[PDB]
């Protein structure tokens, strides 16, 4: 649009990197572990493509990924919390 369309490659490497770390975190906790690489691969890729393609602006893009990682990462520490506790 104006800021989301003028985005650089940095946001791409960061968005995926962050999403992968989170997605893989919950996917590794009890999402498969072995098939994780595959899950996070398609999940992250499809995610970045969804938030980016649906990105309405620089604020919508960051809020999109930040939301997916916040919810995913949270479920990882929340679900594992009881397991470790």
Swiss-Prot record:
Region of interest: Interaction with GCN4: 20-44
Disruption phenotype: Sensitive to amino acid starvation. Normal GCN4 protein level during amino acid starvation.
Subcellular localization(s) per the UniProt record: Nucleus
Family: Belongs to the Mediator complex subunit 15 family.
SUBUNIT field: Component of the Mediator complex, which is composed of at least 21 subunits that form three structurally distinct submodules. The Mediator head module contains MED6, MED8, MED11, SRB4/MED17, SRB5/MED18, ROX3/MED19, SRB2/MED20 and SRB6/MED22, the middle module contains MED1, MED4, NUT1/MED5, MED7, CSE2/MED9, NUT2/MED10, SRB7/MED21 and SOH1/MED31, and the tail module contains MED2, PGD1/MED3, RGR1/MED14, GAL11/MED15 and SIN4/MED16. The head and the middle modules interact directly with RNA polymerase II, whereas the elongated tail module interacts with gene-specific regulatory proteins.
Note: Present with 606 molecules/cell in log phase SD medium.
Function: Component of the Mediator complex, a coactivator involved in the regulated transcription of nearly all RNA polymerase II-dependent genes. Mediator functions as a bridge to convey information from gene-specific regulatory proteins to the basal RNA polymerase II transcription machinery. The Mediator complex, having a compact conformation in its free form, is recruited to promoters by direct interactions with regulatory proteins and serves for the assembly of a functional pre-initiation complex with RNA polymerase II and the general transcription factors.
Protein name: Mediator of RNA polymerase II transcription subunit 15
Gene that specifies this protein: GAL11
